[PDB]
Amino acid sequence: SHMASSCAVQVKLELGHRAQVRKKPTVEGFTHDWMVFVRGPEHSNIQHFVEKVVFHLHESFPRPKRVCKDPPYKVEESGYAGFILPIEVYFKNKEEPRKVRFDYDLFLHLEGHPPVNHLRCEKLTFNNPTEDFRRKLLKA
C-alpha cells in the first residue's frame, strides 16, 4: 500500500525579550530587569507540540540551565550586561528533529534610552510528520 498525498506543516515561533534599567541596582549589583520568552504569534498555543523550552543562561548566573515545561515559556532575571542565550525547543515528537537550538541575543540598553522590546520570528518546516505529530501540530 502507498500514499498519494504529501503534507508539510510550517510553524512560527516568536522569541523575544524586554530589558529595563532598574531605578536602584541590587546589592549584586545588577542594573537591569529583563525577561526572555518563547510564544506563538497572536497568543496561539504551542504546548500542543512543544514538550519543554530550555534557556541556557550565561555561566555567571546561578543555576544556569533553566527549563520550562509548560506556558509561559519565560525567564525573568536581573543583570549588568548582555550575552548570547542559546534556547532549545523540544518537540512532542517521535523522529528527528527532536529539538532545535537558537542563539538569542539578549542585549540591554543604557540609561536614558527607551527600554528594550525585541521580537524575533523563527519559522520551521516539518515535512511529512508522523500522523500523531501532525495532529499535535495542527490541534485547535
Binding site: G82, F107, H109
Partner: peptide
C-alpha cells in the same frame, strides 16, 4: 552604541 557592555 545604544547597547551596554556584554559578558564573556
Amino acid at each position: 552604541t545604544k547597547q551596554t557592555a556584554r559578558k564573556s
